[PDB]
Design a protein around this ligand. Structure first.
Ligand code: 5ZU
Ligand code: ZN
Ligand code: ZN
Length: 231
Protein backbone atom coordinates (compact mmCIF):
# COMPACT_ATOMS: atom_id res chain seq x y z
CA UNK A 1 0.00 0.00 0.00
CA UNK A 2 1.16 3.54 -0.75
CA UNK A 3 2.88 5.10 2.27
CA UNK A 4 1.14 7.99 4.02
CA UNK A 5 2.37 11.05 5.87
CA UNK A 6 2.02 9.48 9.31
CA UNK A 7 4.13 6.48 8.29
CA UNK A 8 7.29 8.29 7.13
CA UNK A 9 9.40 9.98 9.81
CA UNK A 10 10.99 13.21 8.67
CA UNK A 11 14.42 12.27 7.35
CA UNK A 12 13.36 8.91 5.90
CA UNK A 13 12.42 8.10 2.30
CA UNK A 14 10.24 5.35 0.86
CA UNK A 15 10.25 4.03 -2.66
CA UNK A 16 7.07 2.72 -4.32
CA UNK A 17 7.18 0.67 -7.49
CA UNK A 18 4.60 2.08 -9.91
CA UNK A 19 5.49 0.00 -12.98
CA UNK A 20 8.52 -1.81 -14.32
CA UNK A 21 11.44 0.59 -14.17
CA UNK A 22 9.31 3.36 -12.58
CA UNK A 23 9.16 4.28 -8.87
CA UNK A 24 7.92 7.18 -6.88
CA UNK A 25 9.93 8.39 -3.94
CA UNK A 26 8.03 9.67 -0.88
CA UNK A 27 9.43 11.92 1.85
CA UNK A 28 8.12 14.23 4.57
CA UNK A 29 8.97 17.73 5.73
CA UNK A 30 7.60 20.61 7.79
CA UNK A 31 6.01 23.72 6.30
CA UNK A 32 4.48 26.41 8.52
CA UNK A 33 3.93 24.23 11.59
CA UNK A 34 2.75 21.00 9.88
CA UNK A 35 4.49 18.05 8.22
CA UNK A 36 3.49 17.07 4.66
CA UNK A 37 4.33 14.15 2.38
CA UNK A 38 5.94 14.82 -0.97
CA UNK A 39 6.44 12.68 -4.09
CA UNK A 40 8.99 12.52 -6.83
CA UNK A 41 9.81 9.99 -9.54
CA UNK A 42 12.64 7.60 -10.41
CA UNK A 43 12.90 6.16 -13.93
CA UNK A 44 15.30 3.54 -15.27
CA UNK A 45 17.55 5.16 -17.93
CA UNK A 46 19.36 2.22 -19.44
CA UNK A 47 21.95 1.20 -16.86
CA UNK A 48 21.42 4.47 -14.93
CA UNK A 49 18.55 6.20 -13.14
CA UNK A 50 16.90 9.54 -13.92
CA UNK A 51 15.60 11.34 -10.83
CA UNK A 52 12.56 13.64 -10.99
CA UNK A 53 12.66 16.14 -8.09
CA UNK A 54 14.48 16.11 -4.81
CA UNK A 55 13.04 14.65 -1.63
CA UNK A 56 12.48 18.15 -0.16
CA UNK A 57 15.66 19.04 1.66
CA UNK A 58 19.27 17.98 1.96
CA UNK A 59 18.82 15.34 4.66
CA UNK A 60 15.84 13.76 2.93
CA UNK A 61 17.64 13.77 -0.44
CA UNK A 62 20.62 11.99 1.11
CA UNK A 63 18.21 9.33 2.45
CA UNK A 64 16.73 9.06 -1.05
CA UNK A 65 20.12 8.30 -2.59
CA UNK A 66 20.76 5.70 0.12
CA UNK A 67 17.41 3.97 -0.38
CA UNK A 68 17.90 3.93 -4.15
CA UNK A 69 21.28 2.29 -3.70
CA UNK A 70 19.84 -0.25 -1.23
CA UNK A 71 16.72 -1.11 -3.27
CA UNK A 72 17.68 -0.57 -6.94
CA UNK A 73 21.48 -0.54 -7.06
CA UNK A 74 21.94 1.50 -10.20
CA UNK A 75 23.53 4.99 -10.22
CA UNK A 76 21.53 8.20 -10.27
CA UNK A 77 23.22 10.26 -12.99
CA UNK A 78 20.73 13.03 -13.82
CA UNK A 79 17.96 14.86 -11.97
CA UNK A 80 15.21 17.17 -13.24
CA UNK A 81 13.42 19.64 -10.93
CA UNK A 82 9.85 20.30 -12.06
CA UNK A 83 9.60 23.78 -10.48
CA UNK A 84 11.51 26.11 -8.15
CA UNK A 85 10.06 25.30 -4.69
CA UNK A 86 12.05 23.55 -1.93
CA UNK A 87 10.19 20.26 -2.45
CA UNK A 88 11.65 20.21 -5.97
CA UNK A 89 15.15 21.77 -5.69
CA UNK A 90 15.91 21.49 -1.97
CA UNK A 91 18.74 18.95 -1.86
CA UNK A 92 20.21 19.79 -5.28
CA UNK A 93 23.56 20.48 -3.60
CA UNK A 94 23.56 16.96 -2.12
CA UNK A 95 22.82 15.44 -5.52
CA UNK A 96 25.63 17.53 -7.07
CA UNK A 97 28.04 16.29 -4.37
CA UNK A 98 27.00 12.70 -5.12
CA UNK A 99 27.90 13.17 -8.79
CA UNK A 100 24.38 13.78 -10.16
CA UNK A 101 24.00 16.27 -12.99
CA UNK A 102 21.03 18.49 -12.06
CA UNK A 103 18.69 20.13 -14.58
CA UNK A 104 15.83 22.58 -14.69
CA UNK A 105 14.28 24.90 -17.19
CA UNK A 106 15.73 28.41 -17.43
CA UNK A 107 12.43 29.70 -16.03
CA UNK A 108 12.82 27.44 -12.94
CA UNK A 109 16.47 28.44 -12.49
CA UNK A 110 15.60 32.17 -12.55
CA UNK A 111 12.69 31.74 -10.15
CA UNK A 112 14.77 29.65 -7.74
CA UNK A 113 17.45 32.35 -7.74
CA UNK A 114 14.97 35.13 -6.96
CA UNK A 115 13.60 33.04 -4.10
CA UNK A 116 16.98 32.10 -2.65
CA UNK A 117 16.50 28.38 -3.28
CA UNK A 118 19.06 25.93 -4.55
CA UNK A 119 19.71 26.20 -8.27
CA UNK A 120 20.06 23.16 -10.56
CA UNK A 121 23.27 23.30 -12.63
CA UNK A 122 22.04 22.83 -16.21
CA UNK A 123 19.33 24.61 -18.21
CA UNK A 124 16.73 22.64 -20.16
CA UNK A 125 16.16 24.28 -23.54
CA UNK A 126 12.91 23.86 -25.43
CA UNK A 127 10.31 24.29 -22.68
CA UNK A 128 9.56 28.03 -22.72
CA UNK A 129 6.06 27.93 -24.26
CA UNK A 130 2.81 26.32 -23.16
CA UNK A 131 2.52 23.02 -24.97
CA UNK A 132 6.28 22.55 -25.39
CA UNK A 133 7.76 19.07 -24.88
CA UNK A 134 11.26 17.61 -25.05
CA UNK A 135 12.74 14.14 -24.73
CA UNK A 136 15.03 13.59 -21.74
CA UNK A 137 16.23 10.00 -21.89
CA UNK A 138 13.37 7.70 -20.89
CA UNK A 139 10.83 10.47 -20.26
CA UNK A 140 9.15 13.32 -21.98
CA UNK A 141 9.23 16.68 -20.21
CA UNK A 142 6.14 18.84 -20.83
CA UNK A 143 5.48 22.46 -19.97
CA UNK A 144 1.66 22.73 -19.72
CA UNK A 145 1.47 26.40 -18.80
CA UNK A 146 1.32 28.18 -15.50
CA UNK A 147 -0.59 26.49 -12.70
CA UNK A 148 0.70 25.69 -9.24
CA UNK A 149 3.66 27.84 -10.37
CA UNK A 150 4.56 29.61 -13.58
CA UNK A 151 7.34 27.10 -14.38
CA UNK A 152 5.81 23.76 -13.39
CA UNK A 153 6.67 20.81 -15.62
CA UNK A 154 5.02 17.42 -15.83
CA UNK A 155 6.83 14.25 -16.83
CA UNK A 156 5.54 11.27 -18.80
CA UNK A 157 7.14 7.85 -19.04
CA UNK A 158 5.95 6.50 -22.42
CA UNK A 159 7.19 2.94 -21.87
CA UNK A 160 4.88 2.70 -18.84
CA UNK A 161 2.04 5.26 -19.21
CA UNK A 162 3.05 7.00 -16.00
CA UNK A 163 2.29 10.72 -15.72
CA UNK A 164 4.05 12.64 -12.96
CA UNK A 165 2.06 15.82 -12.44
CA UNK A 166 4.00 17.40 -9.65
CA UNK A 167 2.47 20.13 -7.59
CA UNK A 168 0.00 21.11 -10.32
CA UNK A 169 -2.00 17.92 -9.61
CA UNK A 170 -3.68 17.36 -6.25
CA UNK A 171 -4.43 13.98 -4.68
CA UNK A 172 -8.15 13.05 -4.63
CA UNK A 173 -8.49 13.47 -0.87
CA UNK A 174 -7.24 17.06 -1.03
CA UNK A 175 -10.28 19.32 -0.98
CA UNK A 176 -8.70 22.76 -0.44
CA UNK A 177 -6.06 24.57 -2.51
CA UNK A 178 -4.55 25.89 0.69
CA UNK A 179 -1.39 27.88 -0.04
CA UNK A 180 -1.41 29.25 -3.60
CA UNK A 181 1.05 32.13 -3.20
CA UNK A 182 3.03 31.49 -6.38
CA UNK A 183 0.15 30.07 -8.41
CA UNK A 184 -1.69 31.42 -11.45
CA UNK A 185 -5.27 30.48 -10.62
CA UNK A 186 -6.70 31.78 -13.92
CA UNK A 187 -4.26 29.77 -16.04
CA UNK A 188 -4.34 26.55 -13.97
CA UNK A 189 -7.51 25.00 -15.46
CA UNK A 190 -6.27 25.55 -19.02
CA UNK A 191 -2.86 24.11 -18.21
CA UNK A 192 -4.49 20.99 -16.72
CA UNK A 193 -6.49 20.72 -19.96
CA UNK A 194 -3.28 20.71 -22.02
CA UNK A 195 -2.00 17.82 -19.85
CA UNK A 196 -5.17 15.77 -20.45
CA UNK A 197 -4.97 16.52 -24.16
CA UNK A 198 -1.32 15.54 -24.55
CA UNK A 199 -1.36 12.42 -22.29
CA UNK A 200 -4.79 10.83 -22.70
CA UNK A 201 -3.32 7.30 -22.31
CA UNK A 202 -1.84 7.95 -18.86
CA UNK A 203 -2.61 4.89 -16.72
CA UNK A 204 -1.00 6.20 -13.52
CA UNK A 205 -1.00 9.81 -12.36
CA UNK A 206 1.26 10.81 -9.49
CA UNK A 207 0.50 14.10 -7.68
CA UNK A 208 3.21 16.17 -6.09
CA UNK A 209 1.80 15.28 -2.66
CA UNK A 210 -0.25 12.26 -1.64
CA UNK A 211 -1.64 9.12 -3.17
CA UNK A 212 -1.43 8.19 -6.83
CA UNK A 213 -4.56 8.04 -8.92
CA UNK A 214 -5.48 8.12 -12.57
CA UNK A 215 -6.53 10.94 -14.90
CA UNK A 216 -9.45 11.76 -12.58
CA UNK A 217 -6.99 13.75 -10.50
CA UNK A 218 -6.89 16.40 -13.22
CA UNK A 219 -10.58 17.34 -13.04
CA UNK A 220 -10.42 16.90 -9.27
CA UNK A 221 -7.64 19.49 -9.09
CA UNK A 222 -9.49 21.92 -11.36
CA UNK A 223 -12.59 21.85 -9.17
CA UNK A 224 -10.50 22.43 -6.05
CA UNK A 225 -8.78 25.40 -7.71
CA UNK A 226 -12.03 26.96 -8.97
CA UNK A 227 -13.55 26.60 -5.49
CA UNK A 228 -10.80 29.06 -4.40
CA UNK A 229 -11.44 31.32 -7.44
CA UNK A 230 -15.09 31.72 -6.36
CA UNK A 231 -14.49 32.05 -2.59
N1 5ZU B 1 6.17 21.57 -0.04
C1 5ZU B 1 4.76 21.74 -0.14
N2 5ZU B 1 4.07 21.84 -1.28
C2 5ZU B 1 2.74 22.00 -1.11
C3 5ZU B 1 1.86 22.11 -2.33
O1 5ZU B 1 0.66 22.42 -2.22
O2 5ZU B 1 2.39 21.85 -3.44
C4 5ZU B 1 2.27 21.97 0.23
C5 5ZU B 1 0.83 22.15 0.72
C6 5ZU B 1 0.06 20.86 0.86
C7 5ZU B 1 -1.24 20.71 1.36
C8 5ZU B 1 -1.68 19.35 1.36
C9 5ZU B 1 -0.75 18.42 0.88
S1 5ZU B 1 0.63 19.32 0.44
S2 5ZU B 1 3.68 21.80 1.18
ZN1 ZN C 1 5.49 24.07 -5.31
ZN1 ZN D 1 4.57 21.15 -3.39
Amino acid sequence: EYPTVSEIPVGEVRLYQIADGVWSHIATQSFDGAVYPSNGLIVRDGDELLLIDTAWGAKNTAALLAEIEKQIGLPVTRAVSTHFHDDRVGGVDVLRAAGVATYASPSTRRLAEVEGNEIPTHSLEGLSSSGDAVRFGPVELFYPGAAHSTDNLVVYVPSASVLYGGCAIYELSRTSAGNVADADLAEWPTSIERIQQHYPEAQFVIPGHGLPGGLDLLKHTTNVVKAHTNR
